[PDB]
Design a protein around this nucleic acid. Sequence first.
RNA 1: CAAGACGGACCAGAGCGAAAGCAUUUGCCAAGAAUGUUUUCAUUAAUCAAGAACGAAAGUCGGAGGUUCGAAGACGAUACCGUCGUAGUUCCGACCAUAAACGAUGCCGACCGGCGAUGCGGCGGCGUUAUUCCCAUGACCCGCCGGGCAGCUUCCGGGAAACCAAAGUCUUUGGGUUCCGGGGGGAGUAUGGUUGCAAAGCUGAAACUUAAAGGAAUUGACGGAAGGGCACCACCAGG
Lengths: 82, 135, 139, 213, 175, 25
Amino acid sequence: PLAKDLLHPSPEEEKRKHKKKRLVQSPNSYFMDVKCPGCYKITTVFSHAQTVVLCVGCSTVLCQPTGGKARLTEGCSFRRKQ
Amino acid sequence: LGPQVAEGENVFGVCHIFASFNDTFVHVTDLSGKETICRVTGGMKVKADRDESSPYAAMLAAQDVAQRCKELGITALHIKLRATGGNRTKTPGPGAQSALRALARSGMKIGRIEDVTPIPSDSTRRKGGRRGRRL
Amino acid sequence: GWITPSNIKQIQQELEVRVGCLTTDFAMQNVLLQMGLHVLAVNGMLIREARSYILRCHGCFKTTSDMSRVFCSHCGNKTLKKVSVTVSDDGTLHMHFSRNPKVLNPRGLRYSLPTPSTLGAGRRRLNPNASRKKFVKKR
Amino acid sequence: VVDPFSKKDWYDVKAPAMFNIRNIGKTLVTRTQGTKIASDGLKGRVFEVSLADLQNDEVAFRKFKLITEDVQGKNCLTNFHGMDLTRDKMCSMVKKWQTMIEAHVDVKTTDGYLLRLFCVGFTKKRNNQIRKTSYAQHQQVRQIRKKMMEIMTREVQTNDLKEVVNKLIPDSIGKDIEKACQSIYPLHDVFVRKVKMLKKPKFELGKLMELHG
Amino acid sequence: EETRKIPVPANRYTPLKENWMKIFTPIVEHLGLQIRFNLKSRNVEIRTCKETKDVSALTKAADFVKAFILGFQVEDALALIRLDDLFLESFEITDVKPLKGDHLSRAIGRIAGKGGKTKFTIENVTRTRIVLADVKVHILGSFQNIKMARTAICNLILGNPPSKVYGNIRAVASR
Amino acid sequence: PLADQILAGNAVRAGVREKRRGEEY
RNA sequence: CAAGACGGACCAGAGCGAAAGCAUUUGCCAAGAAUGUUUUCAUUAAUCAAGAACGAAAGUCGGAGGUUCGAAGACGAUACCGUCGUAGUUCCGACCAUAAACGAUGCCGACCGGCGAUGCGGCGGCGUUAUUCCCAUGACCCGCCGGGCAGCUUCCGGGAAACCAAAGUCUUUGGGUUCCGGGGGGAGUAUGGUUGCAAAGCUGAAACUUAAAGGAAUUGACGGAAGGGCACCACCAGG
Ligand SMILES: [Zn+2]
């Protein structure tokens, strides 16, 4: 209190804050490569997806929508981007 | 009259102690519930209406019903305490406790004690108004 | 497990040659059985096992056998907790913790303070940050 | 002017053969004077007996209501009519910071005994729980109610009253509900608190002989 | 042999444990009865033993424990052991007039009074003992004393101010 | 206690009261 | 056995709803807040005159049912109380539009101390449980974020003070906007208008009369009242 650099907050405090209440607002989500166990293709999937993303070659269910982050099925691998 | 049962074994009657807010009914009957041995209430013993629901009247009525069952052969009794229930008070008062104490002194052995006061799911209105009480 | 009037004189403590001891408090019996000295009781026979409860501090790791104390000795916080102990004749002691996370958690331990006997004991054991009735008051 | 109790007599009433205590008591009956038959007074006699008066080492809060319809000359025969729990057990079982879940079914047995089954269940506090209250959400209450309804239905619909009441003496249905509803919300002490004789078929003699051995 | 069980609610387990000594001693030395408390069923069971004295006092012993379950101190329930003309009367506050919410709480506070003072006064007026639960109220005393305490309690929940009930109950005790 | 109050009301107070009223050579 | 009633305990510093209000199970119907969102549109918004919808209880018109309770009323005692009991309390369809309908406290927006409890949603994590459950999931445990109901604490500041984290950011006085008060009575009265089957609801004076009316807390007298002590100028037993 009464002495804190509002221009340079600590990064853990910026990650702690609400996504709109940061100094420059930014999303908490990400895009990710998903590799189906029955194949080896790459699918670009939003972390907070609301639709059932299907495999382009296997036509299998990749993620299940939830209230928050999407639930990937068991057996498929994922890797974050950027 | 000595219901063909040896010495050690005993017959169980059941006693309904209706401890109302006007008197106490001590009602002894067979284990089924239909055939009743004797029913002596508080007003059969005392003379006034001040003490119909007194502990002394319940004590004397319990002595009377205990003597009546002892001249028949019933020594063991189950107990069903029972307030007036329904919309009214739902706890057996001092009359029921007096009757239990008197039946304990008389030589009667107590079986199972259970409250059988009628609790509603949720009943109609009570005899009081929006404001009224006892006193 | 039944309690008869014939057992009231029997129930004094945990009941199991020339010189003995008539010690009662667990501290002296503990140090005597640690030294191997044979301790006696109000009854004729001696003591083989002695088990009781002590207070252990989880802040500065110091134990106290005083069952009525509430503050610690070295650190001085209100931080003592019940830990059981048992000793034998051979000089062997074993002392039991509890692996229950209910005892060690800082739930009701932080609250804002106002600016500056045994009755009403269960009211203090409630945490202040909780629902009390709207028309009742804590002092 | 004359004592009525000299004309009365005594009938000895005993439980069916599955209970290790044989005699359950004595009953006062009036004698036949031609106008009415003494056996007609025993066609519907309802008895309340606790289970601790019927077994030695078992619990006491459970009680059974028995219907009596037969007599054969100083030998009285009873039949099942229902059950209940002791009022003090129910009153002590309803605690405060927990949820009470009730269910009921109307089910038919293998021999026409149409029964009404009631169940009451309470939620557990965990062995490391620090929150004062342990409430089940409404959907979880619905799954618990559906699960216990279907379990009691599948346990009594295709089953006969012998093994039904031999489940009722130790309340194995309660153990089944406690084991099966654990994956939703941990239940505390579930009981079949009431069995009601809804519908009774035509009476036959050999089956009560199998009740009494 | 006779037996009798008394349930223990969860709010009464710690008081029962803390002064258990002065609870089991006056039964085993005076009435010669044999007691225990099981934790699986949470029940205090009393049964008669061989060295029983005055068997037609077992019920009294049960009343002892029963009073301590209702919130009475062990001294008053030991008085229930000693005196024979002592009874227990229980009723709810809503059991005589429907009060909902804050009205019920204000009725409770009127029975209690500031510092419990009003309630305490009634005790010394009537030579009774009153413990009132969340909505329940229990009175321990002789019959006419119960009637006087019930009169004062019913008048306080009518809405009569505590001052008038205080003065009238002192005047009635004078008579 | 309750029984102490009942017995104190059942008995009569007594005990201390100093009432001051009223050779060699 | 039947009839109508009502859904106890669970039931809370709880939840939902615009408010009035809402608690037995299951099924159907359409709404809804919060959350999550690297979706879409691109200023579509805030407030209310006129106007419209709902609005506890009682009450009024018509149908059905009347279990309990019960205005008026009939008896008995002493405005209080008891017995009996009509309208009503209940359902359906229209009127009524009034409450201490309360936080006695407009709505939207910004800033301004702390704590940890709780309801919901999301996220992260050692770990324990479905008899060392063989990965996940429900139940707990720790921590964070968002909108909530609601507490405790504070010389933030404000206030007549009680007190308020708003009733603060007010003589250092201006974010936007609606309703509304001007000493006490006459008096929410008369009259006029309007709505209503009616009861009544909405709007609403003046003549006249008066130096007060009222708010906040604090005690101090105030006949007195409850405990004790003492006294043969008080008493018992007496002379
Ligand atoms: Zn320490």
